[PDB]
Amino acid sequence: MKTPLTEAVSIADSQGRFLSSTEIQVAFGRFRQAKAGLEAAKALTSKADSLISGAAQAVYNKFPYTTQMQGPNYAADQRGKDKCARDIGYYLRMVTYCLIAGGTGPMDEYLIAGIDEINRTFELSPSWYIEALKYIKANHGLSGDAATEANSYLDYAINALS
């Protein structure tokens, strides 16, 4: 679980050492950033339904075949649309977790690890998800550090898919 506090402890322990000024500076950096990050998680959470449905439509508009082809890996029916909205909601929810923890840890453990096998196995296209992520990025309406950190996690996800 990659977060400032967690890795600080982990490194000290792997070295059999007590925490020193280095790990304390790590915590300082974390607690300072937590203010912009925690507020960012809130902003994203309040616009969740909007961001999710908007991201879904952006994907449907860029890849029209996804609301037409009848295969189970697509969203031509209501079942597929819910799967898609659900998935996109998952990505958004992981982003809020990352902001809360101040690291990619939540996303790495619950979503990224294994996603390749899932997309391949169920024939889901990474490009669909990337488009959804670009949309959230362009419409979360954040600014300041909040924007930078949230975008860092959205781009992280994009990188993990390409």
Partner: protein, 172 residues
């Protein structure tokens, strides 16, 4: 391992939910108090040798059978190991205080420690005595008003105590 932030995140994920406003505020309150938490960590760490050596000496003074020939702390090798365990448990305690969650302490240190002492013939009850002594000394150091901006560390002190207590309970 979990830190205070990740602890809340893993519980929310299990329910597939985002953190409520109350949950975030709670974490935010912890952030506001963070400076005190880091002083406690720095204070216990900067006095680790003293805390271990004074507590160890006190332990052997209150339970002479430990250093009497045949005792589990008798012979240099066993004495060094005993002092080693004191430093280790204290180290993991400060880790828990730093992370704001007992998981590191429980998983990497306490987990199966009772069984270890039992297999070695090491008196667990006496280990707990040494840990309890470190607790008293650690908390006093953390609560010393000298050289630090005045304020309330009451809550943090209870949290620190609970980690030392978890340690004592794990070995007895």
């Amino acid at each position: 391992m979990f830190d205070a932030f990740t602890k809340v995140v893993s519980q929310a994920d299990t329910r597939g939910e985002m953190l409520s406003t109350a949950q975030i505020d709670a974490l935010s309150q912890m952030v506001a108090e963070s400076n005190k938490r880091l002083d406690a960590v720095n204070r216990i760490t900067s006095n680790a040798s003293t805390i271990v050596s004074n507590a160890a000496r006190s332990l052997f003074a209150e339970q002479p059978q430990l250093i009497a020939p045949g005792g589990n702390a008798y012979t240099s090798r066993r004495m060094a190991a005993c002092l080693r365990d004191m430093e280790i448990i204290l180290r993991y305690v400060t880790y828990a205080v730093f992370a704001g969650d007992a998981s590191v302490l429980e998983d990497r240190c306490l987990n199966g420690l009772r069984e270890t002492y039992l297999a070695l013939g090491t008196p667990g009850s006496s280990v707990a005595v040494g840990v309890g002594k470190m607790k008293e000394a650690a908390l006093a150091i953390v609560n010393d008003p000298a050289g630090i901006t005045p304020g309330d560390c009451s809550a943090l002190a209870s949290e620190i105590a609970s980690y030392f207590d978890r340690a004592c309970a794990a070995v007895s």
